[PDB]
Structure 1
């Protein structure tokens, strides 16, 4: 037997996503492709954030992604920032940003 994930060429668990959809009371029935499509979407979004987060760890001279890096990756990316516009990443801090009028008159 081959896992539905492998058949779909995915790392995320199709079987689990199907199960979670069924028990989440979203609809009376859940078609076969739904959990595959959804798993693929979750995998892709995950790759996107880890891709940018990893880059932030790199720029910071770090090999391990910590919350700060996820925050920097999300807030510096226009689209991810909007998707997560009402989300707070614990231990994320904020982007360095000082309003120009506050700087000394060099």
Structure 2
């Protein structure tokens, strides 16, 4: 039969929430944060939009040979993962990795595998038999 009546008193209702945006939520990409990391580093007055992009490309290659040789060391030692011991080997045993890590070493004057001729000092004139009396 008849339904129960609502209270005669006005107000006391919950306020309506503000409508959410129509535009769909994008994914977080890292290069927009790398721009801010360069700014936090304070390398110069302004960071160009291309700078973090070009530096991301540089960064990829800066350990590519480290990863290659450390993964070779892991395969050789029959390991499932790369560990610090593979890096201790890979770094010390390859001079291009000694250049990639920290202080750049001088490229020229590097040791060649073929035995080089010994540069003898300039010999003085040998003392000939002195003229007697």
Asked if these proteins are the same fold (TM beyond 0.5), I'd say: yes
Question: 4+ runs of 1 displaced by more than 3 Å?
Answer: 1-13, 85-106
Unaligned runs of 5+ in 2: 1-17, 124-133
Deviation at 1:39, TM superposition (A): 1.0
Bigger helix fraction: 1
- Contact kept? 2:99, 2:105, Cα under 8 Å: no
Q: Tell which structure's C-alpha radius of gyration is larger.
A: 2
User: 1:10 pairs with 22, 27, 33, which one?
Assistant: 27
Unaligned runs of 5+ in 1: none
| TM-score (ref. length: structure 1) | 0.63
Count of matched residue positions in the alignment of Structure 1 and Structure 2: 106
Deviation at 1:95, TM superposition (A): 20
Bigger strand fraction: 1
Deviation at 1:49, TM superposition (A): 1.2
Q: Which has the higher contact order (CA 8 A, sep 6+)?
A: 1
User: 2:113 pairs with 82, 88, 96, which one?
Assistant: 96
| TM-score (ref. length: structure 2) | 0.51
1:47-80 CA-to-partner distances (Å, cap 9, x unmatched) read: 2211111111111111211001012111121111
What is the Cα-based RMSD across aligned positions, in Å? 9.4
